[model samples]
Target: TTFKLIINGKTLKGETTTEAVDAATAEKVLKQYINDNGIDGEWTYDDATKTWTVTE
Candidate 1:
């Protein structure tokens, strides 16, 4: 799936794979990646669909 992040007045895009696991874990992994890259955005997790939604 794709993850979009905006930080420091710049927007960044990244892609990551999802493991067949809990939504929280999946979102954590994605969020960590974004954070590591110094990106910030609103991260919303869909527990049922096991997806992360990043919005401005």
Candidate 2:
């Protein structure tokens, strides 16, 4: 699993060698993103590779 934090096509944070983010961590990141970006936060989790694409 991986996390791609996208705000207006710019990726703020991305995945690491660890491969995934904690469920709690992603929530907090999204929390900040939605508040900071004020875009309502678009979230799409892709299977297989388990990558989370958060956009606005």
Candidate 3:
């Protein structure tokens, strides 16, 4: 399935995988993106929206 994210207020697209793309799936997504890629933050996913929201 396809998904996107809002991290540190930055909108990201082109995320694909291996999903029904639940919140648990959203966690791994951070590692797949952004500089400082592996940083820790509160990752929340809305299955209805297919968008991950990051809170740090």
Per TM-score, the best of the predicted structures is 1
Please give the CA lDDT of all the candidate structures.
0.54, 0.50, 0.53
The C-alpha stretches of model 3 lying farther than 4 A from their native spots are 9-27, 34-39
Which digits, one per residue and each the tens of the lDDT, describe model 3 over residues 1-56?
Answer: 56666655334423433354464664575546644643336666677756665544
The C-alpha RMSD of each candidate to the native structure, in angstroms, is 4.7, 4.8, 4.7
Off by over 4 Å in 1: 1-9, 46-49
lDDT, model 3, position 44: 64
Between candidates 2 and 3, which one is better according to lDDT?
A: 3
**Steric collisions counted per model:** 0, 0, 0
How high is the lDDT of residue 53 in model 3? Answer: 59
Pairs of residues at least 3 apart in sequence or in different chains that clash in candidate 3: none
* TM-score preference between candidates 2 and 3, better one: 3
Which candidate, 1 or 3, would have the higher TM-score against the true structure? 1
Candidate 2 has what TM-score? 0.40
